């Protein structure tokens, strides 16, 4: 067999995003779950790069967010992508739950 | 037609041209966008005000 099916690590990628059997009549409402995986990656990456410049003391916390906005090189891009990304993360999750409430995805065996 | 190994046949020319153009496009798209922005807003930049206080 192929190397992507005999390796211990490559077979998990092959059995999930390469050779996974899908129903051929699903529509664009079944795309919301992959898009939520991209939303979690953007929130973790932009938050780790902002945690290098942040102070959590109650007399330094407000002014350190201002330091990221004014002093950090491309620091305004990091915050704006983080604060607006949380609203986009909640909008897709409201559309994800409403699809499964519509098409009956909660019933047995799921 | 008869241009395919000159264009996109080779595995190392399918990724060896789209990585080659990825820097040539990177600097000429950056220059032409900056040139358009500073003529749509001509007269308001600091370069135009500093030449008025000469």
């Amino acid at each position: 067999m192929a190397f992507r099916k005999s390796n211990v690590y490559l077979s998990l990628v092959n059995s999930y995003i390469i050779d996974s059997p899908q129903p051929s009549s699903i529509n664009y409402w079944w795309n919301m779950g992959s898009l939520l995986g991209l939303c979690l990656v953007i929130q973790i990456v932009t938050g780790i790069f902002m945690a290098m410049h942040y102070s959590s003391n109650i007399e330094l916390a407000f002014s350190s967010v201002e330091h990221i906005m004014r002093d950090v090189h491309n620091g305004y891009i990091l915050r704006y992508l983080h604060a607006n990304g949380a609203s986009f993360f909640f909008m897709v999750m409201f559309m994800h739950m409403a699809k499964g409430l519509y098409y009956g995805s909660y019933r047995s065996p799921r | 037609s008869s241009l395919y190994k000159t264009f996109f046949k080779r595995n190392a020319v399918f990724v060896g041209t789209i990585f080659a153009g990825a820097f040539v496009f990177q600097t000429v798209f950056d220059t032409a966008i900056t040139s358009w922005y500073e003529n749509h807003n001509k007269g308001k930049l600091w370069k135009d005000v500093k030449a008025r206080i000469a």
Binding site: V8, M52, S55 | -
Partner: protein, 110 residues
């Protein structure tokens, strides 16, 4: 062999973790241990004064160095725990050895 190669990666990430957290106390050993180590990367040919100025966030071991060392110290223990999961997957397909060093499929207990 794959079980031994994932183990070497865990050992490098555990050394990096203990170094980053020792610089967060900011004692007198913490400052001069971080000065000696970060000055070693200024000897790399043709790219030497760009890793060290990106590790410092400035011109010496200063306030941007301590703030970014704590944020990386929160993170690498969670990368180690994901390498531990991949470590036990490579163990499950072959099992353990024994002090005799021969096959053990003739006598097994749960």
């Amino acid at each position: 062999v794959t079980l031994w190669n994932v183990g070497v990666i865990i050992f490098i990430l555990t050394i990096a973790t203990a170094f980053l957290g020792y610089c967060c106390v900011y004692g007198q050993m913490s400052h001069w241990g971080a000065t000696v180590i970060t000055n070693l990367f200024s000897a790399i040919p043709f790219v030497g004064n760009d890793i060290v100025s990106w590790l410092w966030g400035g011109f010496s071991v200063s306030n941007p160095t301590i703030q970014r060392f704590f944020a990386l110290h929160y993170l690498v223990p969670f990368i180690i725990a994901a390498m531990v999961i991949m470590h036990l997957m490579a163990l499950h397909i072959h099992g353990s050895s024994n002090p005799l060093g021969i096959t053990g499929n003739l006598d097994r207990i749960p």
